């Protein structure tokens, strides 16, 4: 029976003869049907985690994961346990929930997983080339080592009065406050916190020159570049549209400003220990002798500042929002300010910040309820066996880990959805290496990453901005608490999170009503 093969060919010929309606109709029915037939077959493998079923091909569970990622995970965890895959915008994501997932992903061997393959398409078009994820891991490890050189205790000692002054200036001059002229007012915390975060971070990490730029129309380039930081970069990283060209123009104009300051400092040999720019100028030689270019130094600055912008601004937005319905906590924090700072007669110092455990537990608890990053990912480079299982995660998959999900589990945090800074009494550290330690190129960090509380990640990709974030959030909240009481308009409460930015932001407009503790207090200086 070669007669059959002839009819194969005849059928192929008649196929290409169909009316164009039926040919496009067939162009959609065939992949859909195949997609379901493939999942059903896939769901038989014993060496693959369960795969979340989905109707639309390529799209996958993208809509559900994107809008309600922790709800998606809880549903999947109830059905399939702690390991399961789901299709997402063309990728397969293998999720591993809970502390053993933290260990599987955050401590995966450098050979098995790649962060830069996962992230580069999100960050490289915003930050620029050659740094962070547009470079091999060992370069990244050392860039973190260079940034850490400016994030020392002694640096934080000089940043505290800089950050504090910036907050007072903001209270004095910003339209949102004007404390010298109003005793009460209403703000949207998603306007005020992003602005306060960029002003305080610029002044301390970037220096006075870069801070001064933000009082000009130059500040619009930060807005344009900020807009370019979006999950759309995973599908359309470059499209010949205005959004993208404004992004690229901002990246070039902003990195040009940094290089101009860098080259002017070197031209005058004016390199002190003022800011992170001084620091990187003195210290950006890799261990194989290669030196970072002024452009790579500038792109590193953008990426570090931009990442710290979003996480910190989100977090201080959430602190304000939780305290607006917790007058008890504001009272509690105010008393600690009065006791640590001798009734407000002692100036805030970095040392005194460490003696304010309730303030630091408020940051800590906010990073529990509202982790700014619901998902961290790697691309799997070599097949991985899931220990004590029959599961194998093949190369070309992605592993996804979500400590923010574990932060919200009653099993690890009793009453996980109640905001209680006292769940941290006797434990106000920003995190804790609770045992051994290892160095990946930027300093010794906890060897284990099994803690259920992992707001700053762990392993080779762990955050290097933790202590800067606490310093900055600490000075800002110390001043907010000693200066203002605040509350919600009638009937309003803590807004639910918006996860689509991939930074967990309050849903707007998130407004609070502030009023001066001392209506007669005046903020000195010029305006
Ligand atoms: C509330 C504040 C912050 C939180 C909760 C936070 C959280 C995190 C987390 C969870 C990671 C691990 C990423 C991964 O494993 O994929 C990370 C990495 C990182 N963060 Fe932060 N971060 C914060 C603030 C900052 C700040 C202020 C800076 C800079 C001053 C910064 C710079 C970095 C850097 C350089 C990395 C390393 C990424 C890598 O190795 O690939 N972060 N952060
Ligand atoms: C890649 C990015 C991210 N954003 C959102 N969901 C997951 C993510 F991994 C992020 O980790 C965010 N971030 C972490 N600490 C501060 N910012 C990041 C890290 C380093 C950096 F230099 C810039 C930067 F954006």
Author numbering: 8 to 534
Source paper text:
Target-based azole resistance in Candida albicans involves overexpression of the ERG11 gene encoding lanosterol 14α-demethylase (LDM), and/or the presence of single or multiple mutations in this enzyme. The azole antifungals inhibit sterol 14α-demethylase (CYP51, SDM), thereby preventing biosynthesis of the essential and fungal specific sterol ergosterol, and resulting in the collateral synthesis of toxic sterols. We have used, as surrogates, structurally aligned mutations in recombinant hexahistidine-tagged full-length Saccharomyces cerevisiae LDM6×His (ScLDM6×His) to elucidate how differential susceptibility to azole drugs is conferred by LDM of the C. albicans Darlington strain. Phenotypes and high-resolution X-ray crystal structures were determined for the surrogate enzymes in complex with representative short-tailed (voriconazole) and long-tailed (itraconazole) triazoles.
Boat-shaped crystals were also obtained using Ni-NTA affinity and SEC purified ScErg11p6×His I471T mutant in complex with either ITC or VCZ. These formed within one week across all experimental conditions tested (43–46% PEG 400 and 0.5 M glycine, pH 9.1–9.6). While we were unable to differentiate the ScLDM6×His wild-type and I471T structures from the mutation at I471, we detected spectral changes consistent with modification of the electronic environment of the heme. Furthermore, consistent with functional modification of the heme, the insertion of I471T into the hydrophobic environment near K151 gave blue shifts to 416 nm in both ScLDM6×His I471T and ScLDM6×His Y140H I471T preparations, as well as lower spectral responses to the binding of VCZ by ScLDM6×His I471T. The presence of the I471T mutation reduced the spectral response due to type II binding of VCZ and ITC, with the major difference observed in the trough region of the difference spectrum. Despite these changes, the type II binding curves showed that both VCZ and ITC bound tightly to the wild-type and I471T mutant enzymes, with each drug giving IC50 values of ~0.6–0.8 µM in the presence of 2 µM enzyme. The appearance of the AO seems more complicated and requires either small (ScLDM6×His Y140F in complex with FLC) or larger (ScLDM6×His or ScLDM6×His I471T in complex with VCZ) changes in conformation of M509, plus a modified conformation of the H317 sidechain in helix I involved in the proton channel. The capture of the water molecule by ScLDM6×His I471T complexed with ITC but not the complex with VCZ may have implications for catalytic efficiency.
